[PDB]
Design a protein around this nucleic acid. Structure first.
Lengths: 113, 131, 180, 122, 200, 48
RNA sequence: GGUGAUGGCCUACCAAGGCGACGACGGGUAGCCGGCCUGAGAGGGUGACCGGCCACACUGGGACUGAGAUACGGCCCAGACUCC
RNA sequence: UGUAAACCUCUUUCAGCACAGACGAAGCGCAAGUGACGGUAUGUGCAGAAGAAGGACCGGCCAACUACGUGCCAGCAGCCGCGGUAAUACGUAGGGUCCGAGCGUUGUCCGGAAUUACUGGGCGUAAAGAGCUCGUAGGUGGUUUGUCGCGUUGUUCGUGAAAACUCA
C-alpha cells in the first residue's frame, strides 16, 4: 500500500515527528515521497501543520492513514472535507503567541519610572 | 613554425616595450585590430593604424611612454592558449589586481573587457591579462 | 619615533693562519608604521655595532609603500635571488599573516591585515629582498590612471574606493580629535 | 611537461615508507622475549644499552629497547610493545611500555610516572 | 572547572592588577618565585600567549571554551576582535559584576553558580549564560539576607556601571539595551595578537 | 580542462543492406536487437 | 523455442566475424554512495554512526510456491563439523 | 613558599536526608481505565565547608631555573645532541609554566610538503635532453568570405531525496 505515517526524529526524550506519504513496506526512519506536516506533542498545545491541498491529493489517490494521523486529520478538518461529513470543521488549537521582548523591556522601564 | 599569432603580437609588444622602441610592425588581422582598439581605449597605447606590405596588409602601433620615460605597460600575459583553452563563466570571471588591470574576453558580443562583459551578463573565452 | 628590528644573527668566520677571526652580522628592518620601510645588513666584531649599522643604513634606504588604510592594493609575486613571495590583501581585522621576516617587514611598515607565503629560499636575507621587490612592483591606482590617461572610475572598481573614503574618514577623525 | 603528456601518462605520485610495519596498523602488540641482554651504541655515544629480541603475535622477531634503569625481564617473559625511534642505534624502531603483563614501575621515580608505570605515594 | 588558586599569583606573573585593589600586588608587583627577577628571551609567541592567559584568567573561561568562542567570532561576519570581545563580555558573571552587585568575578561566578538570580521567569544556575538585547534580569526572592549584597544595594557607588546596562529598582533590577562594542567597553589588551595566535 | 577528442565504436542496423563504407550517417537508438546492436540508421547522409 | 518482457537468453542452419596500445585478455586489492576528516582551494585519505542501493546467509548447486524469492529463523541433494 | 594559611564572617550549587511529584497520551478503549522509562526528571525544605585535583614539561624549535646525587657511568631524547666531581639537557627535591576531570604516549590520515607543482615546479654544471635522423596513430595549425551552431556562452524548465554543511 501507500500509507500515511509518522516518523520519529529528535533526541531521546522529546520527539518531533514529521508526516509522511510512503509505502508500508519501508521502515520507520526511512525513505519518503512528500512530507506534508509535522507534530510536536512535547509542547502542551501540541503543534500541528499540514499542506491540506496535497493531503487531499494523497487521499484522492487512495492512501490509507493510521489512527493517530487520522485523528489529526479529523481535528484539522481534512478528513471531514475529503468525506464531506459536515464539512471541514476546524478544531485546531493554536499556540499562544507569547509576549514580545521589546514590549517587556519597555514596560519594565516605564514601570520603574 | 607559427601557431600562436596572438602570442606573437603580445610578446612583440613586450620585447619592444623593454627595448623602448617607438613603433611596432606586424601583419594584419581582424582580431589583432579589435585587440588594438580595446587597448587604445583602455589607455595602454597611443594609436594604431594599417599600412600595407607586398602580399598583405600590416599593422603599425604607436606606443605610450611616460614623460620621464615611464613605461605605461607593466606586465602582460596570455592565458587561454592552444592546448589549454580557458573559458569563463560570468560567475567566475578573472579579477586582475583586484580589477585594476584588464582581462580580454571573446564573446558573442565580440571582444570585451571583463567589466563590460559582466554588465551585459555575458561570458566566454578569455584571451589575455594586462597590467 | 621609529620601530626597529633584529631578525637574524649568524656567527661568521674568516679563516687565517692563526685560526678563525670571527665576526657578527645582523639584519635590521625599520619602519615608521605608516609606509616608510628601510633595510640594512650590518656586521661587525660587535653585535651592537652591527645593529647600529643596520639601523642607520635602514634610515638611509627607506622606501614608500602604496597602502590603503591598513592593507595593500593587489596581490603580487616578488622575486629575489630565489626568494619567492605571494603577497595578497586581506579584509580588515584579519591580521599580519606571515612568518618571521616578512612579519617584521610589514609590521614595521604599518600593515595590519595582509597575507603572505614563502615558497623558496627560506633564508631571511633573500626573503626580505623579495618582499621589497614586491612592494616595488606595487602601483597606486592614481599613478595607473596617470600612466594610461584614464580616470580612477574606469581604472578601479567600487570596493577599493569604498575603502579609500572610509579610511580617509577615520583619518580625518583621528587628526581632528588629536589637534582640533 | 605538456598537457598532452599529462593526459596520456599522468602524475604518478610517490609512496611513502610505512613506519612500524610489524605492528600491522596496531598501536601495540603482545610479545615474548626470546633473549634479554645489552648492546653498545655507535662510536660517539659511549655507553651500554639494554635490548631484547621479541617474538610478536604478528609473527615477526624484533628487538626492543628497555627504558628506566631496572628490568624484571628474563627470557620467555611476556611483555607489551610500543613504537619509538632511537637515534643511537642502527636497526631499532620499537620500545617497551613498562607496567604491562610482566614489567614494573621502576622504583623511586616520582616525576613522569605515567611513562614508566609506577604509582603515587598517598 | 573553576580555577581556585591565587589571583595575586597570576596578576604578578604578568604584573597587572586583574582585581584592582591588590595591596600584595602593590607590594610585590614584580613576578614571584626563586627566579622572579630573572631576564628574558623575548618573542612574539610569548606576548600572543600572554594576552589570552590574561583574558581567560580575568574571566574564568578555559582554553577549549575560549577556542569555541573564537571560532564563533571568526564565523560571524564582523571582524574577529570586536566580535569575540563582545561575545566574551556577554557572560553573566561579568554582566552582574559590571553592574556592581558583585564585588569580584569570583563572587559573581559563585552567586550565579548557586542560582540566586532569575532571568525572565526561569531559574538560572548557569554562569556562562549569554544575554541578548532586551533581557530583564531580576533577582529572586531571597537574595536579601546576603549581607555584603545588602551593602551592594545600599552603597554600590564603587566602580562605574557602563552605558549599555542599567539598574532601576529596589531589588536592583538589571536591564540591557544593546550589546556593547569595543570602543564602548575599553577593558584590557587589544586582541589582534590573539586573533593572530589562533590564526597560527 | 583541455578538450579531449575521443573515439567510440557503435554497432547498428539496417533492414535492407544499403550503406557502404566511408560515409556520414544520422542515427537513433532503438530497443536492443541483439547482443551489441542498439542503434539504427535514420538517413545515410553524406555520400562517398 | 522461451520470458512478464526486448535479447544467442536457448536452439538448428547459414556467412565469418568481433575485440584491442583511447590497454582487450590476464593479475592484485576493494562493497558503492549521500557524506566524514583535512586543506585557503583545488585536491588527497576515508566509507565506523545516520540514511539509500548491491551481494551473502555452514560450503556448493537446484527449484517449487506464490503477485513478488539471494527464500536468514522454508524444502531436495551433495560435502565438512556437531548431537541422540 | 604566600593572601597561600589559621583566623571571624558568607554562600550554599553539585552529591547527601524528608515531603510533594509531572508533560511525554485533542491520544487507545467504549470501557472506568490507560506510563516500561519512574516514584525518576523537577521543585519544596533540612545541618553544615562540610564529600570532593591531579597529569606533562623547563638548552633550543617551545612561555617555563636553582640546588642536590651521579660525573663515559647509569640514563634521556621528535631533530640539533647531552653525561669522564662542580650537568639550567640524566634521577630527587624546592620552584615555575601549560592543561584541567583530564593528562602524556603509541598507531593511522591530511596538513606545513610549491616534496607529482592543472591553479602551483624543472632538465648547461646541482638527478634529469634519448646518439642522431625518417615517419604511422596521435597532438597542434597561416590570411580571408559565407554557412552549421557540436564545443562554447546567456536565460528559463525539470532534477540534483531527506539528513549532513552554511545563514536566521
Amino acid at each position: 500500500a501507500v500509507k500515511i505515517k509518522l516518523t520519529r526524529l529528535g533526541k531521546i526524550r522529546n520527539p518531533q515527528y514529521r508526516i509522511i506519504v510512503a509505502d508500508a513496506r519501508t521502515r520507520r526512519d526511512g525513505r519518503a515521497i512528500e512530507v506534508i506536516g509535522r507534530y510536536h506533542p512535547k509542547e502542551e498545545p501540541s503543534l500541528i501543520q499540514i499542506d491540506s491541498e496535497r493531503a487531499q491529493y494523497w487521499l484522492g489517490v487512495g492512501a490509507q492513514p493510521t489512527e493517530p494521523v487520522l485523528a489529526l486529520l479529523k481535528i484539522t478538518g481534512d478528513w471531514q472535507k475529503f468525506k464531506g461529513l459536515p464539512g471541514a470543521e476546524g478544531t485546531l488549537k493554536v499556540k499562544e503567541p507569547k509576549p514580545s521582548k521589546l514590549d517587556l523591556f519597555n514596560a519594565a522601564l516605564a514601570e520603574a519610572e | 613554425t607559427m601557431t600562436d599569432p596572438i602570442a606573437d603580437f603580445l610578446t612583440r609588444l613586450r620585447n619592444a616595450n623593454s627595448a623602448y622602441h617607438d613603433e611596432v610592425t606586424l601583419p594584419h588581422s581582424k582580431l589583432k585590430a579589435n585587440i588594438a582598439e580595446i587597448l587604445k581605449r583602455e589607455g595602454y597605447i597611443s594609436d594604431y593604424r594599417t599600412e600595407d606590405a607586398r602580399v598583405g596588409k600590416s599593422l603599425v602601433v604607436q606606443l605610450k611612454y611616460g614623460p620621464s620615460r615611464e613605461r605605461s605597460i607593466a606586465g602582460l600575459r596570455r592565458v587561454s592558449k592552444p592546448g589549454l583553452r580557458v573559458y569563463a563563466k560570468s560567475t567566475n570571471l578573472p579579477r586582475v589586481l583586484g580589477g585594476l588591470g584588464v582581462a580580454i574576453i571573446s564573446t558573442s558580443s565580440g571582444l570585451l573587457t571583463d567589466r563590460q562583459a559582466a554588465r551585459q551578463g555575458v561570458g566566454g573565452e578569455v584571451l589575455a591579462y594586462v597590467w | 619615533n621609529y620601530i626597529e628590528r633584529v631578525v637574524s644573527i649568524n656567527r661568521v668566520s674568516k679563516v687565517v693562519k692563526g685560526g678563525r677571526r670571527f665576526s657578527f652580522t645582523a639584519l635590521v628592518i625599520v619602519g615608521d608604521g605608516k609606509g616608510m620601510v628601510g633595510v640594512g645588513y650590518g656586521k661587525a666584531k660587535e653585535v651592537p655595532a652591527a645593529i647600529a649599522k643596520g639601523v642607520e643604513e635602514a634610515r638611509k634606504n627607506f622606501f614608500r609603500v602604496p597602502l590603503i588604510g591598513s592593507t595593500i592594493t593587489h596581490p603580487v609575486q616578488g622575486e629575489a635571488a630565489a626568494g619567492v613571495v605571494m603577497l595578497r590583501p586581506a579584509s580588515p581585522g584579519t591580521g599580519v599573516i606571515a612568518g618571521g621576516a616578512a612579519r617584521a617587514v610589514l609590521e614595521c611598515a604599518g600593515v595590519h591585515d595582509i597575507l603572505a607565503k614563502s615558497l623558496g629560499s627560506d633564508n631571511a636575507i633573500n626573503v626580505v629582498h623579495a618582499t621589497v621587490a614586491a612592494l616595488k612592483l606595487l602601483q597606486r591606482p592614481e599613478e595607473v590612471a596617470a600612466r594610461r590617461g584614464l580616470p580612477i572610475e574606469d581604472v578601479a572598481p567600487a570596493g577599493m574606493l569604498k575603502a579609500r573614503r572610509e579610511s580617509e574618514a577615520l583619518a580625518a577623525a583621528a587628526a581632528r580629535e588629536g589637534s582640533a | 611537461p605538456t598537457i598532452q603528456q599529462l593526459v596520456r601518462k599522468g602524475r604518478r605520485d610517490k609512496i611513502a615508507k610505512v613506519k612500524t610495519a610489524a605492528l600491522k596498523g596496531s598501536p601495540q602488540r603482545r610479545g615474548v622475549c626470546t633473549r634479554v641482554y645489552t648492546t653498545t651504541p655507535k662510536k660517539p655515544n659511549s655507553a651500554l644499552r639494554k635490548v631484547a629480541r621479541v617474538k610478536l603475535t604478528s609473527q615477526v622477531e624484533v628487538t626492543a629497547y628497555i627504558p628506566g634503569e631496572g628490568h624484571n625481564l628474563q627470557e620467555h617473559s611476556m611483555v607489551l610493545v610500543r613504537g619509538g625511534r632511537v637515534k643511537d642505534l642502527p636497526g631499532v624502531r620499537y620500545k617497551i611500555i613498562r607496567g604491562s603483563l610482566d614489567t614494573q614501575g621502576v622504583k623511586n621515580r616520582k616525576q613522569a610516572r605515567s611513562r614508566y608505570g609506577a604509582k603515587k605515594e598517598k | 572547572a573553576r580555577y581556585t588558586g591565587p589571583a595575586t599569583r597570576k596578576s604578578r606573573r604578568l604584573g597587572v592588577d586583574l582585581v584592582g585593589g591588590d595591596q600584595s600586588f602593590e607590594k610585590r608587583p614584580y613576578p614571584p618565585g626563586q627566579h622572579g627577577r630573572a631576564r628574558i628571551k623575548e618573542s612574539e609567541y610569548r606576548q600572543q600567549l600572554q594576552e589570552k592567559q590574561k583574558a581567560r584568567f580575568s574571566y574564568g573561561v578555559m582554553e577549549k571554551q575560549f577556542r569555541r568562542y573564537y571560532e564563533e567570532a571568526n564565523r560571524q561576519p564582523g571582524k574577529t576582535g570586536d566580535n569575540l570581545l563582545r561575545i566574551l563580555e556577554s557572560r553573566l558573571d561579568n554582566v552582574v559584576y559590571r553592574a556592581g552587585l558583585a564585588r569580584t568575578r569570583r563572587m559573581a561566578r559563585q552567586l550565579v553558580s548557586h542560582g540566586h538570580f532569575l532571568v525572565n521567569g526561569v531559574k538560572v544556575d548557569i554562569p556562562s549564560y549569554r544575554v541578548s538585547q532586551y533581557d530583564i534580569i531580576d533577582v529572586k526572592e531571597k537574595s536579601l539576607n546576603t549581607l555584603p549584597f545588602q551593602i551592594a544595594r545600599e552603597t554600590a557607588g564603587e566602580r562605574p556601571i557602563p552605558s549599555w546596562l542599567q539598574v532601576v529598582g529596589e531589588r536592583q533590577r538589571i536591564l540591557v539595551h544593546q550589546l556593547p562594542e569595543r570602543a564602548q567597553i575599553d577593558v584590557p589588551l587589544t586582541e589582534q595578537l590573539i586573533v593572530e595566535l589562533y590564526s597560527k | 580542462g583541455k578538450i579531449i577528442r575521443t573515439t567510440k565504436k557503435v554497432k547498428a542496423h539496417d533492414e535492407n543492406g544499403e550503406a557502404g563504407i566511408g560515409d556520414r550517417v544520422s542515427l537513433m537508438e532503438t530497443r536492443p536487437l541483439s547482443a551489441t546492436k542498439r542503434w539504427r540508421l535514420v538517413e545515410i547522409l553524406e555520400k562517398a
